[PDB]
Each structure stands twice: as structure tokens, then as C-alpha cells.
């Protein structure tokens, strides 16, 4: 199933390479060490509501 | 927006409002970055000279978090025509960079393939704006948001009196009286995935608003990602 299965456990973008899951993020986000989570680089990353 | 709810503090930070000479909103837009706004091409035909306001939620009181930005360059898709309303998309590069803060933030641009198989296959999306709250009414002074379910392409086409091209998609309700309306055009249609909102559409048109058997028509963002990218480098 890979990406077809819970988005391959990715926080955001998910594609398959070598029949394996590879996660990626939108600009302003850095891929975490686990290669799945997307971590913001600043106080206002794209796509996040501002609840402060 | 007909029906739906008021956008509470910080819930729709990527909403932008195009204001004319008289300082009144006539169309919406989406913040893509500190310098770029996404909107509808048909919104450009109105208002010879216009500005962009971000961070607003109540057009009446001057609140304090609002900010106006002049447009440096207007990038309208050349294939757009009032005769078909196809290619209803445009991008605005502002003179000065938007400063992000409470109620001011960009929506994420997704990847084509992923967006189509993961975002647009979602049950619903969210549309927002300061448009009319009824087909016959004035522009809303309060910013509203409305969750609109994705509509099957087949149902979409047969329900429409006009041709639904591949640069368009349906969202909304068959009979329930909630829909986007005049004035929301050019505004955001976002889809949430794990608490992150990605731009998926642009309020484009519809036969009236919240009419039974009719749906809201949006410009399909995934069909213009490359065009958007090229435009943001202009
Ligand atoms: C030019 S054509 O007809 O030959 C045409 C040609 C080819 C394809 C499509 C169209 C077409 C149809 C209706 C319209 N009319 C509207 O889109 C509209 C009117 C109103 C209000 F006046 F309020 F009734 N609100 N409104 C609208 C705006 C945004 C979203 C939604 C969603 N519910 C509705 C429009 F522009 C274009
Ligand atoms: Ca205001």
C-alpha cells in the first residue's frame, strides 16, 4: 500500500521511490530525522492557523 | 458566504481582500508568500486600480492588525475568457512583503500528484470570504468560512448548465443552503491534512448561490501549480 496506506505515515507530501515511501514537506518546513515529520523553520509556517 | 460560520481569531490567516479606489472589498485572494497573492482572473476585470488588505476580519472597525499592500505586478492567465470562465486564475506580486502575524499567514501550495490523490479525495474542503450572505444582499463586513464537501465530477457536470472544464471542480451541497457567493470570488478553498491547510482551489463561479441542485465552482489549483511557480518567479 505504501503512500496509499495512511499517507505512508508522512506529515505532508508522500511519493514512492524504489517501491519505498519517501516523505517531503512544503517550503518553510524541514523534514525531521525520522524522515516523516515536517518541522517549521519560523513562527509562521504555511498552512497553520494562528492560535496564539 | 451563505451559511457557514464567522472566521474566529486566527482561523483563516491566509485570506486576502482586494479593495478598490473606494476602499471596499470586491473579491478575495489567498496569501501564498510574503510577496504573492493568488486570486481569480475575472476579479481583475473589475476595479481599474486596486490594493490588497491582509489580516482583516471586520471591514468596519479599524481593529489594528490589518495591513494594506499595493500590487507591483498583476499576472493574469491569458487563456481566461468571460465566455467560458475557464482558466479563472491570477497571481499578484506585492510592492512590499507581507509581515506574518496573528491572522496573517500563507496557505501551503501542495504537490500535484499528492494533492489530487490525498487532498482532493478528502471528504471536504474549506472556503472563505467577505462575499454576499444571500444571492441578493450586500458584501459581508465579517469574514466567514464554510466547510464544503467535494462533489463527484460526474454529478457536477450534469448538474451544471455550463461546461465544467478540467481546470474546475465542484464543492458544496445539493440542497443545504450553504455556498460561496458573489464577492468571495478569488478567495481561498483549502483542504486540511493533519492540521495543515493547503490551497486547493479558487472561488470561481456558480449559478446563483446555495441553489438546490447546484454547486459552487472553483478553479482547480493542482491544474496550475507549474503556472503558479513560473508566475512567482516573475
Ligand atoms: C458569464 S456566463 O454566465 O456566460 C458563464 C459561461 C461559461 C461558464 C460559467 C458561466 C457563469 C455562470 C454564472 C455566474 N454567476 C456567478 O458566479 C454568481 C452570480 C452571483 C449572484 F449575483 F449572487 F447571484 N454570485 N455568483 C457567484 C460567485 C462566486 C461563487 C458562486 C457559487 N455559489 C456564485 C458566472 F459568473 C459565470
Ligand atoms: Ca478593517
Question: What count of Cα atoms within 13 Å lies in the side-chain half-sphere of residue B200?
Answer: 30
Nearest CA residue ID for atom 26, ligand 1 = B182
Q: Which grid coordinates are listed for B213?
A: 441542485
* Residue B112 at interface with chain A, using a CB cutoff of 8 Å: no
The DSSP line for B102-164 is: TTB-PPBP--HHHIIIIITTSSEEEEEES-BSSSSSPBPSB-EEEEEEEE-HHHHHHH-SS--
A51 lies in which domain range? 1-52
User: Residue B106 burial (CB < 10 Å; 0-12/13-18/19+)?
Assistant: buried
Distance CA A24, CA A35 (A): 8
Mutate to test the interface with B, among A7, A47, A48 (most CBs of B within 10 A): A47
Domain B1-12+107-222 matches domain B13-106+223-234 at the CATH topology level: yes
Mutate to test the pocket of ligand 1, among B189, B206, B216 (most ligand atoms within 8 A of CB): B206
Indicate the domain borders of chain B.
1-12+107-222, 13-106+223-234
**Cβ atoms < 10 Å from Cβ of B153:** 12
Among candidate residues B225, B221, B119, B218, the one with its CA nearest the CA of residue B169: B218
Distance CA B178, CA B185 (A): 15
Q: How many domains does chain A have?
A: 1
Distance CA A43, CA B38 (A): 22
Residues 6+ apart with CB under 8 A from B159: B170, B174, B213, B214, B215
User: Does B56 contact ligand 1 (Cβ within 6 A)?
Assistant: no
* Nearest CA-CA distance, residue A10 and chain B, Å: 10
- Domain of A9, CATH number, reads 2.10.25.10
Class of domain B1-12+107-222: mainly beta
Ligand 1 geometric centre to CA of B117 (Å)? 28
Distance CA B103, CA B7 (A): 10
CA torsion sign for B47, B56, A38, B169 is: negative
Catalytic, B69? Answer no
**Ligand in nearest proximity to the CA of B172:** 1
Q: Do B10 and A12 touch (CB under 8 A)?
A: no
Instruction: Please report the resolution in angstroms.
Output: 2.2
Nearest CA residue ID for atom 1, ligand 1 = B82
A-side interface with B, Cβ within 8 Å?
3, 7, 11-15, 24, 26-27, 38, 43-52
User: Does B15 contact ligand 1 (Cβ within 6 A)?
Assistant: no
User: Does B106 contact ligand 1 (Cβ within 6 A)?
Assistant: no
Does domain B13-106+223-234 fall into CATH 2.40.10.10?
Answer: yes
Nearest CA residue ID for atom 33, ligand 1 = B209
Amino acid at each position: 500500500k505504501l503512500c496509499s496506506l495512511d499517507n505512508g505515515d508522512c506529515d505532508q507530501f508522500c511519493h514512492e521511490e524504489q517501491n519505498s515511501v519517501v516523505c517531503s514537506c512544503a517550503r518553510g518546513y524541514t523534514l525531521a530525522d525520522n524522515g516523516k515529520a515536517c518541522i517549521p523553520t519560523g513562527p509562521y509556517p504555511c498552512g497553520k492557523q494562528t492560535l496564539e | 458566504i451563505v451559511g457557514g460560520q464567522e472566521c474566529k481569531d486566527g482561523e483563516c490567516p491566509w485570506q486576502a481582500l482586494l479593495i478598490n479606489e473606494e476602499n471596499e472589498g470586491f473579491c478575495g485572494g489567498t496569501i501564498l508568500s510574503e510577496f504573492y497573492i493568488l486570486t481569480a482572473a475575472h476579479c481583475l476585470y473589475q476595479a481599474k486600480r486596486f490594493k490588497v488588505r491582509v489580516g482583516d476580519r471586520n471591514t468596519e472597525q479599524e481593529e489594528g492588525g490589518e495591513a494594506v499592500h499595493e500590487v507591483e505586478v498583476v499576472i493574469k492567465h491569458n487563456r481566461f475568457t468571460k465566455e467560458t470562465y475557464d482558466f479563472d486564475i491570477a497571481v499578484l506580486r506585492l510592492k512590499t512583503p507581507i509581515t506574518f502575524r496573528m491572522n496573517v499567514a500563507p496557505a501551503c501550495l501542495p504537490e500535484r500528484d499528492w494533492a489530487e490523490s490525498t487532498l482532493m479525495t478528502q471528504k471536504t474542503g474549506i472556503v472563505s470570504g467577505f462575499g454576499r450572505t444571500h444571492e441578493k444582499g450586500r458584501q459581508s463586513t465579517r469574514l466567514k468560512m464554510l466547510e464544503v464537501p467535494y462533489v463527484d465530477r460526474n454529478s457536477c457536470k450534469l448538474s451544471s448548465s455550463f461546461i465544467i472544464t478540467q481546470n474546475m471542480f465542484c464543492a458544496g451541497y445539493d440542497t443545504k443552503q450553504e455556498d460561496a457567493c458573489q464577492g468571495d470570488s478569488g478567495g481561498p478553498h483549502v483542504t486540511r491534512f493533519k492540521d495543515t491547510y493547503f490551497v486547493t482551489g479558487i472561488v470561481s463561479w456558480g449559478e446563483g448561490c446555495a441553489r438546490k441542485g447546484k454547486y459552487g465552482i472553483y478553479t482547480k489549483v493542482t491544474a496550475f501549480l507549474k503556472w503558479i511557480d513560473r508566475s512567482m518567479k516573475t
